[PDB]
């Protein structure tokens, strides 16, 4: 009941009902949480 | 005791020398890393019946961009502060031509002096602190991201790039610890820079109202 | 005979309860492993546990080896009578 | 409180059909037994304690 | 440490101080019966609370059919070779797993810890 | 362990064995048999007989078990039970080489030139609970352990550039007053935190509330090995702290909103707010 | 980028959630074209470098030309570009893949 009307507007900003900006980009990245998956960096762990 | 008292006065001093360095004032380099025994030798070994009187500790600094605008900080002597006692300072500012002033209150102030500082709005702006709060730099904590205050020329670039008004930004009230650490007035915009795990870096803005 | 020494931050009772739980939990595990390493390739419990269709590796040991130790409110069975759990025991019996 | 800190807790009673709390020694005296050697033998059964 | 009752109206005698001979006087507040104090101390407050319950357990507990018994530890005062033991069953249960005994011989009632 | 004891709160009734109110009309009377030695070796050095000598005495016995565990001895107690309450009291004490630690107190005789007995009992019943020996008032019990997981370890980047974890002692309390705990010495002011978020709001700010709330949501979700994507946590903890202050998601939080009149009529106060409108 | 990762992820883990898988996309291309990992390859390295640059240019999340809209784009696709540059380097794709 709290968060009913938050949605992504046509310029990729996540706005409230009164158009109060909540995030400049959805999830801070801009991607849907449906087409992502786990990977590894393989650059931070090894030694110098 | 005094060993606890010579320790605190050095700690509180080291904090303020960064607080005024953040606001963009000019502080000499070695003043930032003034170790304890160096402080103990310069200003005095002990303030209990000693040379450090909580006066002889005051600081006057000048801005980087302009040598005229200066800031003062006062260390009152009484635990809680009265009325003319700040007017003693208001007179000390009146004589030296300085508007930016701070007072490091020792333990408290009277509802009296709360009325006596909100009146001189257009001139002689003073900031009231507490001795306890200045004992630790909160800006170097883990949870606190990095804030930066934007000039009034940059703020008009946001609202014209994202085609925003100034009512549509996220808000911050000028009463929380970091709003006062930077000396922020209503109508300013502060920029937060935090690292995130999905993108790597994210910049958000806050309107102080 | 007052030969126990409490550990930092532990009452004498609570140190005793913690050790009695360790002895009993290890028997549920060590007996449980015995129930498994004796199973066969044709067993039908192992066939539903291995493929992940239904069941867990503790139901095998509970059916074959030992049900284990019960507890209400996250602690051992309390003294519902006065200094007893049932009228079939003698007072202040702390056995398993 | 800087007053009852020294004396300690006071035994009270909440009788039916009355509004306010009542100290127990009062309701004891309302039955007779005004003396304090006779009251303190109905409540304490051995004076070596 | 005890208590004092008035000898006339049977009430509680309060302690008072007289500025003449430097002696504690017990006074009444209904009448004014007087007398002097023999121990000259008023208040005592035991915070350790290390009272040994050997002074609180009763000798007739050896008639309980729901308590364990022993043939190992005999009684010293009578030589009976059967006892009945239990725990503190009271407060001060921080390190309270001692084991008080009571002889079960009729009319001995001897009690002892170990 | 020393900083542990220095942080924990300790009152007087935790370090006392028993107390007794005696009656010495003269300091040489010494009603109890054996305290005459030390009180006398004070008495040949007699000071502070200014107005009178109070015939009422207060005698306190201490437990060296509870004394040494906090590294206390009655010297510091003796000055602070004086320095902190006034000078109306006067404390003479034993030497700790004697097995039992007793210190006797009399009222300042300047008052004798409301009964003093009830006053002395009031003071006795007031000092054992309002002692404030050490530590912060509200934090009651503080534990100690070093973890084995990589969650609370100290991960450093060595000189050759490898992540190495180190076991380090951490402390956990039951009770919160963080602004003072942060200000103490040899306590890390960066990584110390509290699990209450209104406290972080008053002490640290608003962004710290955002991040702490996110962390606690993550910790409660990933407790049983489950997993939930990040965007949902971020969006929730962003819309929850958007208007500057902490508005809870409750009936009151929804009421204080910039939303229209026909939405607050769907929540239990239709007619009055619509009459206002 | 190796030094920036060590401050983004202080603990030291390596499991992150990202767009399209890269190791599986290399494994697929190794079989749509019958790549024999036994003979010398014909992939010039300065081709790898410039191809990865050009690809990184065409991944716009925030489309704009002026600053404050050309740095938010670099903040959005910061982690993915690091991953893409570390996986498709010239040494690895001439040695392993
Ligand atoms: Zn009488
Ligand atoms: Zn016997």
Swiss-Prot record, chain A:
Can you name this protein?
Answer: DNA-directed RNA polymerase II subunit RPB1
- Which organism was this protein described from? Homo sapiens
- Please explain the role this protein plays, according to its UniProt record: Catalytic core component of RNA polymerase II (Pol II), a DNA-dependent RNA polymerase which synthesizes mRNA precursors and many functional non-coding RNAs using the four ribonucleoside triphosphates as substrates. Pol II-mediated transcription cycle proceeds through transcription initiation, transcription elongation and transcription termination stages.
Q: Domain note for this entry?
A: The C-terminal domain (CTD) serves as a platform for assembly of factors that regulate transcription initiation, elongation, termination and mRNA processing.
What family is it from? Belongs to the RNA polymerase beta' chain family.
> What is the disorder linked to it?
Neurodevelopmental disorder with hypotonia and variable intellectual and behavioral abnormalities: An autosomal dominant neurodevelopmental disorder characterized by profound infantile-onset hypotonia, developmental delay with poor speech, delayed walking, and impaired intellectual development. Additional variable features include feeding difficulties, dysmorphic features, and visual defects.
Output the superkingdom of the source species.
Eukaryota
> Where, per UniProt, does this protein localize?
Nucleus; Cytoplasm; Chromosome
Complete protein: which residues are present? 866 to 913 of 1970
From Swiss-Prot, chain C:
Result after altering residue 15 to M? In NEDHIB; profound; decreased cell viability
The organism's place on the tree of life at top rank = Eukaryota
User: Where would you find this protein in the cell?
Assistant: Nucleus; Cytoplasm; Chromosome
Reproduce the UniProt comment on modification after translation.
Answer: The tandem heptapeptide repeats in the C-terminal domain (CTD) can be highly phosphorylated. The phosphorylation activates Pol II. Phosphorylation occurs mainly at residues 'Ser-2' and 'Ser-5' of the heptapeptide repeat and is mediated, at least, by CDK7 and CDK9. POLR2A associated with DNA is specifically phosphorylated at 'Ser-5' of the CTD by CDK7, promoting transcription initiation by triggering dissociation from DNA. Phosphorylated at 'Ser-2', Ser-5' and 'Ser-7' of the CTD by CDK9 (P-TEFb complex), promoting transcription elongation.
The entry sums up its family as follows: Belongs to the RNA polymerase beta' chain family.
This protein's domain notes: The C-terminal domain (CTD) serves as a platform for assembly of factors that regulate transcription initiation, elongation, termination and mRNA processing. The trigger loop allows entry of NTPs into the active site, switching between an open and closed state with each NTP addition cycle.
Q: What protein is this chain from?
A: DNA-directed RNA polymerase II subunit RPB1
Instruction: Show which stretch of the intact protein is covered.
Output: 722 to 817 of 1970
UniProtKB/Swiss-Prot annotation, chain E:
Indicate the quaternary assembly. Component of the RNA polymerase II (Pol II) complex consisting of 12 subunits.
Q: Which domain of life is it from?
A: Eukaryota
What family does the database annotate?
A: Belongs to the archaeal RpoM/eukaryotic RPA12/RPB9/RPC11 RNA polymerase family.
- Cited function: DNA-dependent RNA polymerase catalyzes the transcription of DNA into RNA using the four ribonucleoside triphosphates as substrates. Component of RNA polymerase II which synthesizes mRNA precursors and many functional non-coding RNAs. Pol II is the central component of the basal RNA polymerase II transcription machinery. It is composed of mobile elements that move relative to each other. RPB9 is part of the upper jaw surrounding the central large cleft and thought to grab the incoming DNA template.
UniProt main location, coarse: nucleus
Do you know which SMART domains this protein is assigned to?
A: RPOL9, ZnF_C2C2
Cellular component terms, GO, for this chain's entry? nucleolus; nucleus; RNA polymerase II, core complex
Question: What name does this protein carry?
Answer: DNA-directed RNA polymerase II subunit RPB9
Q: Which GO terms describe its biological process?
A: maintenance of transcriptional fidelity during transcription elongation by RNA polymerase II; transcription by RNA polymerase II; transcription initiation at RNA polymerase II promoter; transcription-coupled nucleotide-excision repair
UniProt-listed InterPro entries: DNA-dir_RNA_pol-M_15_CS (IPR019761), Rpa12/Rpb9/Rpc10/TFS (IPR012164), Zn_ribbon_RPB9 (IPR001529), Zn_ribbon_RPB9_C (IPR034012), Znf_TFIIS (IPR001222)
Residues binding Zn(2+) 1? 6, 9, 28, 31
> PROSITE patterns from the entry?
RNA_POL_M_15KD (PS01030), ZF_TFIIS_1 (PS00466), ZF_TFIIS_2 (PS51133)
From Swiss-Prot, chain F:
Q: Where does DNA template strand bind?
A: 251
Q: What does its PTM field state?
A: The tandem heptapeptide repeats in the C-terminal domain (CTD) can be highly phosphorylated. The phosphorylation activates Pol II. Phosphorylation occurs mainly at residues 'Ser-2' and 'Ser-5' of the heptapeptide repeat and is mediated, at least, by CDK7 and CDK9. POLR2A associated with DNA is specifically phosphorylated at 'Ser-5' of the CTD by CDK7, promoting transcription initiation by triggering dissociation from DNA. Phosphorylated at 'Ser-2', Ser-5' and 'Ser-7' of the CTD by CDK9 (P-TEFb complex), promoting transcription elongation. Among tandem heptapeptide repeats of the C-terminal domain (CTD) some do not match the Y-S-P-T-S-P-S consensus, the seventh serine residue 'Ser-7' being replaced by a lysine. 'Lys-7' in these non-consensus heptapeptide repeats can be alternatively acetylated, methylated and dimethylated. EP300 is one of the enzyme able to acetylate 'Lys-7'. Acetylation at 'Lys-7' of non-consensus heptapeptide repeats is associated with 'Ser-2' phosphorylation and active transcription. Regulates initiation or early elongation steps of transcription specially for inducible genes.
| Subcellular location(s) per record | Nucleus; Cytoplasm; Chromosome
- Binding sites annotated in the UniProt record for DNA nontemplate strand: 256
Q: Which family does it belong to?
A: Belongs to the RNA polymerase beta' chain family.
Q: What is this protein called?
A: DNA-directed RNA polymerase II subunit RPB1
Q: Which gene encodes it?
A: POLR2A
């Amino acid at each position: 009941k709290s968060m009913e009307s938050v949605m992504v507007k046509y310029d990729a900003t996540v706005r409230n009902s009164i158009n109060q900006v909540v995030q400049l980009r959805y999830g801070e990245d801009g991607l849907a949480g449906e087409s992502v998956e786990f990977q590894n960096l393989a650059t931070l762990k090894p030694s110098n | 005791d005094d060993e606890e008292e010579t320790y605190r006065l050095w700690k509180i001093r080291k904090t303020i020398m960064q607080l005024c360095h953040d606001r963009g004032y000019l502080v000499t380099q070695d003043e930032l890393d003034q170790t304890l025994e160096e402080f103990k030798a310069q200003f005095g070994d002990k303030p209990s019946e000693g040379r450090p009187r909580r006066t002889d500790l005051t600081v006057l600094v000048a801005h980087n961009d302009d040598p005229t605008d200066q800031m003062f900080v006062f260390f009152p002597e009484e635990p809680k502060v009265g009325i003319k006692t700040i007017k003693v300072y208001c007179q000390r500012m009146q004589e030296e031509n300085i508007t930016r002033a701070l007072i490091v209150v020792q333990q408290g102030m009277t509802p009296s002096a709360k009325q006596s500082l909100v009146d001189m709005a257009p001139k002689y702006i003073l900031e009231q602190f507490l001795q306890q709060e200045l004992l630790i730099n909160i800006t170097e904590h883990e949870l606190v991201p990095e804030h930066v205050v934007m000039t009034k020329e940059e703020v008009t670039e946001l609202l014209a790039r994202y085609k925003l008004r100034e009512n549509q930004l996220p808000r911050i009230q000028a009463g929380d610890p970091v709003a006062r650490y930077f000396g922020i007035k209503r109508g300013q915009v502060v920029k937060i820079i935090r690292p995130s795990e999905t993108a790597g870096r994210y910049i958000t803005y806050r309107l102080v109202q | 005979n007052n030969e126990l020494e409490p550990t930092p931050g532990n009452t004498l009772r609570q140190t005793f309860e913690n050790q009695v739980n360790r002895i009993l939990n290890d028997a549920r595990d060590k007996t449980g492993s015995s129930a498994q390493k004796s199973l066969s390739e044709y067993n039908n419990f192992k066939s539903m546990v291995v493929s992940g269709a239904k069941g867990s590796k503790i139901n095998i040991s509970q059916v074959i080896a030992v049900v284990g130790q019960q507890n209400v409110e996250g602690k051992r069975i309390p003294f519902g009578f006065k200094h007893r759990t049932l009228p079939h025991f003698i007072k202040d019996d702390y056995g398993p | 409180g800087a007053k009852k800190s020294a004396i300690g807790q006071r035994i009270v009673a909440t009788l039916p059909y009355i509004k306010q709390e009542v100290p127990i020694i009062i309701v004891f005296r309302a039955l007779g037994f005004v003396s304090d050697r006779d009251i303190l033998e109905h409540i304490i059964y051995d004076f070596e304690d | 440490v005890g208590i004092r009752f008035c000898q006339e109206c049977n009430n509680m005698l309060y302690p008072k101080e007289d500025k003449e001979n430097r002696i504690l006087l017990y006074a009444c507040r209904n009448c004014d019966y007087q007398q002097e104090a023999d121990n000259s101390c008023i208040y005592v407050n035991k915070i350790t609370h290390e009272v040994d319950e050997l002074t609180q357990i009763i000798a007739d507990v050896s008639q309980d059919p729901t308590l364990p018994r022993t043939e190992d530890h005999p009684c010293q005062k009578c030589g009976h070779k059967e006892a009945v033991f239990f725990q503190s069953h009271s407060a001060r249960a921080e390190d309270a797993m001692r084991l008080y005994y009571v002889c079960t011989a009729p009319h001995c009632g001897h009690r002892w810890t170990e | 362990k020393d900083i542990l004891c220095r942080l924990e709160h300790t009152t007087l009734r935790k370090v006392t064995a028993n107390t007794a109110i005696y009656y010495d009309p003269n300091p040489q009377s010494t009603v109890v048999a054996e305290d005459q030695e030390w009180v006398n070796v004070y008495y040949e050095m007699p000071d502070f007989d200014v107005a009178r000598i109070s015939p009422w005495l207060l005698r306190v016995e201490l437990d060296r078990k509870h004394m040494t565990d906090r590294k206390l001895t009655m010297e510091q107690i003796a000055e602070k039970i004086n320095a902190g309450f006034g000078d109306d009291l006067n404390c003479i004490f034993n030497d700790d080489n004697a097995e039992k630690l007793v210190l006797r107190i009399r009222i300042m005789n300047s008052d004798e030139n409301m009964d003093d007995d009830v006053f002395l009992r009031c003071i006795e019943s007031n000092m054992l609970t309002d002692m404030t020996l050490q530590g912060i008032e509200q934090i009651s019990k503080v534990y100690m352990h070093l973890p084995q997981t990589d969650n609370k370890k100290k991960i450093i980047i060595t000189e050759d550039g490898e992540f190495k974890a180190l076991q380090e002692w951490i402390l956990e309390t039951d009770g919160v007053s963080l602004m003072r705990v942060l200000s103490e010495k040899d306590v890390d002011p960066v990584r110390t935190t509290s699990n209450d978020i209104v406290e972080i709001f008053t002490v640290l700010g608003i962004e710290a509330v955002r991040k702490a709330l996110e962390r606690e949501l993550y910790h409660v979700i990933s407790f049983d090995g489950s997993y939930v994507n990040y965007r949902h946590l971020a969006l929730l903890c962003d819309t929850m702290t958007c208007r500057g202050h902490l508005m809870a998601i409750t009936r009151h939080g929804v009421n204080r909103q910039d939303t229209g009149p026909l939405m607050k009529c769907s929540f239990e106060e239709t007619v009055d707010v619509l009459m206002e409108a | 980028d190796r030094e920036v990762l060590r401050v983004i992820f202080p603990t030291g883990d390596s499991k992150v959630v990202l767009p399209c898988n890269l190791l599986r996309m290399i494994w697929n291309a190794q079989k749509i074209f019958h790549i024999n990992p036994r003979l010398p390859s014909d992939l010039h390295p300065i081709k790898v470098v410039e191809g990865v640059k050009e690809l990184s240019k065409k991944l716009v999340i925030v489309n704009g030309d002026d600053p404050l809209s050309r740095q938010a784009q670099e903040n959005a696709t910061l982690l993915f570009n690091i991953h893409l540059r570390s996986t498709l380097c010239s040494r690895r794709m001439a040695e392993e893949f």
